[PDB]
Ligand binder design. Structure first.
Ligand SMILES: [Ca+2]
Ligand SMILES: [Zn+2]
Ligand SMILES: [Zn+2]
Ligand SMILES: [Zn+2]
Lengths: 189, 189, 191
C-alpha cells in the first residue's frame, strides 16, 4: 500500500502494522507499534507526515497537508474512524474522535480528547488534558483521571492490535454460513 | 476482501454483495440480500458485527466496536455514505444519514431516520418511527407515512442493487472518451 | 485503472486524468482531462450519471453518488476536499467543497464559492456564486475577498500539477524500513 512520488518513498517501521488497503504516499514516516487501519490515506505529496510510535490511524482516516507542511501525530496519538488531520500537530497520547477534522497549524495538547464529529479551526491551540468538542470545537472541561486511564486502555488495545495483525491477519475466503464450531470474537486473544 | 484475525473468519451469505474494495475483518456476519459498498470497513477485530438481511452499508462506511461488543444492523438497515457505526444497535429498517456517527451502546428504534452529519451519543436510545438529527442528535418529530414509504423505496433500490452487482458488476478498463453508442445510466434498471 | 461496469455501463476516463489505483469508478462516471482522483474516492454512478469536468479534483475517501436517473456534476476546477460527499448535486466552476462536507440532491453551488469544512448543504439548496458558506445546515456568511479567490485558485492549480506529477511518477513501491540521509524528502517536491 506504499506509493512513491517524485522518488520520495514512505518509511515504515518493521514493528508497525499497515493494513494492505491503507495508502501511504510520499514523505510518510511510520514509527514502531503504529496501527494503520483500512482505507487510511497518509498522503505526503505536498509536505511531510510523521506518525510517532504506538499511535494508531483508523479506518478511512485521512492525513494530508499543504506544500512544505509538517503533519505530526505524537506517540500514542489515537485517531478515530474517519477523522481528517490537515497540517496539524496531535500531541502525545491525544484522542481524536471519529469523523473529526483538525485543520492546519492547529495543535492539540497532550492527553486531550476531541469529541467525535468536531472541527478544530485552523491555527487553534488546544491545551493539554482537556475535553474539547463541537464544530468549531471549544474546551468543555478538564479530563478526569478516570477518562485518562480509559483512553490509555483504548490506545494500549490498538498497540496490541498491531501485534495481533502482524501475527495473524491474512486474506481468507469467507465462510458461506455460520457454523457451530467456528471461532468467534469470544476467541479473541 | 475478507481478512481473518486470531483465526476468526467472516461469514458472507452467497446472496449478499460485498464490493471487492470493501474490507471485512474478523467476526463479521453478512446475511442474504445485503449490499456492502466501496471502502466499507466492517472491522470485527474486537467484537462481533452482524449485518442482517436486505441491509446496505455504503461507501467509506465504518463498522467497529468495543472489545466483546456486538454491533448490530437489523433487517433493511440503511447506512448512508461515510456513516460510522460503533458498538451500537440499528433497528429494523432504519436510515442512518450520510456522514453520521452512532456511538457505543446507542440504539435507533425501528423505521427511524437519522439525518446526515448527525451524532448519536453513547448509550442514547432513539425511539422508533421518528426523525432525529443534529450533533448531538435530538428527536425532531414523528416520521410521516410518506417519509416511511420513501425510505422503503430507497432500501428496495439497494436490495435490487445487490442483485444487479452479483449479476453484472465486473472489473473493466475504462473507455478513453464518451461515445454516441456506449451504454449509459439510461440503460439501468 | 480501477473501474467497474454495471449493467454493461463502463466509466469514461480521459488519458490525461489521474485516478489513483485505489479509487473506485462504477458505472456511468465520466472523467475529463486533468482531473485528479485520490485514494478511496468512490465515484459510484450505479443509479445515475457522474460527470467530473476537466482540471477538477476529488480527494481522499470522497464519495460521489446520486439517486436513479440523477446527474451529479462537478464542473471545471471543482475542488472536492477530503471526505466530502456529493449526492446528486451541481458543483459550479472553480468551487471548493470543504473537507468532510455533505452536498445533497439538487443542491447547486454557484461558481467560485467556498464551502467550509464539515458543512451540510440541504437538498435543493441554491448557494450563490462568490461567497463563503458553512455550517450544518450550511448558511451563506459573506462575500469572498479577492485574496480568498486567488488562494483557492493556487490550491486547485496544485492539484492539476499533482495529476501530472502522479501520472509522471507515482508508483507502487516497498517502503524503506528506516529513515536515511540519502532518501528524497518533501524538500524534493516541486511545490
Ligand atoms: Ca466523514
Ligand atoms: Zn489536503
Ligand atoms: Zn473503534
Ligand atoms: Zn447514495
Amino acid at each position: 500500500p506504499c506509493y512513491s512520488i517524485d522518488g520520495v518513498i514512505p518509511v515504515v517501521s518493521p514493528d508497525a502494522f499497515v493494513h494492505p488497503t491503507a495508502v501511504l504516499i510520499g514523505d510518510v514516516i511510520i514509527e514502531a507499534g503504529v496501527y494503520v487501519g483500512p482505507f487510511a490515506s497518509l498522503r505526503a505529496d505536498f509536505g511531510r507526515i510523521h506518525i510517532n510510535q504506538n499511535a494508531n490511524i483508523q479506518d478511512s482516516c485521512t492525513v494530508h497537508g499543504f506544500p512544505q507542511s509538517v503533519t505530526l501525530v505524537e506517540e500514542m496519538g489515537h485517531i478515530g474512524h474517519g477523522a481528517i488531520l490537515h497540517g496539524c500537530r496531535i500531541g502525545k497520547n491525544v484522542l481524536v474522535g471519529m469523523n473529526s477534522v483538525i485543520l492546519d497549524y492547529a495543535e492539540i495538547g497532550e492527553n486531550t480528547i476531541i469529541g467525535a464529529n468536531s472541527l478544530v479551526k485552523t491555527k487553534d491551540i488546544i491545551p493539554a488534558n482537556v475535553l474539547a468538542m463541537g464544530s468549531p470545537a471549544k474546551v468543555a472541561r478538564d479530563l478526569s483521571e478516570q477518562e485518562k486511564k480509559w483512553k490509555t486502555r483504548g490506545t494500549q488495545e490498538y498497540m496490541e492490535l498491531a501485534q495481533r495483525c502482524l501475527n495473524s491477519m491474512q486474506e481468507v475466503q469467507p465462510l458461506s454460513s455460520e457454523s457451530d464450531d467456528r471461532l468467534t470474537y469470544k476467541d479473541f486473544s
